[PDB]
Structure 1
């Protein structure tokens, strides 16, 4: 079929730069990342899951790398969070379920994302969450042997406290912590602290269980009981994903399915 390989760059999606590309023949939309990168391509080739941004391929034009990735028309989860309000609790529970499925998948194949935040969680046309950007990602389990991490990666308001206090740490509780900060942002529309350190007053208040303060006072007791188990300073005592899936709020019926068309009489 002629011209089937031609794509037109129609608009900017993010910033390296991310462009929306449309196929000249089929009109299929893809996101093109125009660029660490060698590792991002290698990790992306391992990935295949409904809550993980799809990798279609790559092309190297001299010094420039072109990553052909899934287009998510709903944009970033970040723009679904109303500042200081958040979003309706049933929406946050659905986004959190899909975030857990995506992270379970990644950890299962021994990959840690290391930069989970709402800017990296994209939504398709049906508002299905997709974990995006594997530029900071790494392999923490190979040949069934766990590798402890030591590199400083992520975004300070979402990083686990052990990444700041310890030389080495396990990879999985770090992604669990950032998911908990994402859950906090979705339910309160604010970040609880700048960084999880003792020098940070907001972080000390949380360890002192002052939940009458913002953002915790905006969060219902059931999802807050979950946050009490995720945002635990000691990563060895922090709730694992199998146990998040057994939490009372995680399994609380709150939301109806996608609106489906119907007529009466």
Structure 2
């Protein structure tokens, strides 16, 4: 009810809906509430949200419906979003970026292990708790890619153009896991350079061509140290069947480099 919760401010607009800081009128407990005006989509999102139990995935509290409105309740992330830790044109200190990337991979390993693909990994959807632990949020595009140990291919275009893998723009059907790996590499670029490399990974985009031609003397690549850049060379591979897998990311030199807080 409008009687149990006070909507204090907008936190943002999700893939499908919008998120308010709600304060409990009785207890003053502060949560995040997703406000959904209108379906089969929301039933599927709630069901995926109920599956989730991991330190690097957002906590789901539950849901209420009142008419053509529905309410989803989640752990309010007191640290806000990763997006707000990225300084435009700078990024953030490499040790902070490595720790976030470790935590991002842990959450993605978890999701992939329960057969879920996120499909919209980007810094707006990566939240931080009071100890700066990263939480993967927004399951509005999430879907099953593995069930009874059998993989299904994706055949729907969605996500955010600067984060989408090139196969999603080109192939009728594609594997879910390499698409989420790609978007994690764009997140890593953003954290280390404070800029996105291209509007979209299409041959008509000059910045994408420049990367395929290995011009890493250009921005954002020249801002990035040789070790993390070597990892990005393995992640941002156009052919998803040649792209590095998460088990191999875990073996990468930069991924395993001790860095000072």
Query: TM-score by structure 2 length?
Result: 0.94
Post-superposition Cα deviations, 1:143-200, rounded to whole Å, max 9, x if no partner, equal 1110001100100000000001111110000000000000000000110011101111
Q: Which moved more, 1:224-233 or 1:121-130?
A: 121-130
User: Which of residues 235, 239, 253 is equivalent to 1:248?
Assistant: 253
User: Which of residues 176, 194, 197 is equivalent to 1:192?
Assistant: 197
Match of 1:28 in 2: 29
Match of 1:155 in 2: 160
Post-superposition Cα deviations, 1:184-234, rounded to whole Å, max 9, x if no partner, equal 000001100111011111111111111001100000000000000000011
Shift of residue 30, structure 1, vs aligned partner? 1.2
Q: Which moved more, 1:21-30 or 1:39-48?
A: 21-30
- What is the SS of the residue equivalent to 2:88? coil
Question: Is the 1:9–1:21 Cα contact (8 Å) retained in structure 2?
Answer: yes
Question: Is the 1:4–1:25 Cα contact (8 Å) retained in structure 2?
Answer: no
- What is the SS of the residue equivalent to 1:37? helix
- CA distance in 1 between counterparts of 2:184 and 2:60 reads 23
Q: Which moved more, 1:20-29 or 1:86-95?
A: 20-29
- CA distance in 1 between counterparts of 2:2 and 2:24 reads 7
Q: Which moved more, 1:127-136 or 1:172-181?
A: 127-136
Query: TM-score by structure 1 length?
Result: 0.92
Count of matched residue positions in the alignment of Structure 1 and Structure 2: 254
Match of 1:114 in 2: 119
Shift of residue 87, structure 1, vs aligned partner? 0.5
Question: Is the 1:160–1:174 Cα contact (8 Å) retained in structure 2?
Answer: yes
Shift of residue 64, structure 1, vs aligned partner? 0.7
Post-superposition Cα deviations, 1:48-81, rounded to whole Å, max 9, x if no partner, equal 1111111110011111110001100111111111
Question: Is the 1:4–1:23 Cα contact (8 Å) retained in structure 2?
Answer: no
Match of 2:240 in 1: 235
Structure 1 pair 198–115 and aligned structure 2 pair: CA distance change class (3 A): same
Q: What stretches of structure 1 of length at least 5 have no aligned partner? A: 257-265
1:80 aligns with 2:85: yes
- CA distance in 1 between counterparts of 2:69 and 2:260 reads 45
Give RMSD over aligned pairs: 1.7
Shift of residue 25, structure 1, vs aligned partner? 4.5
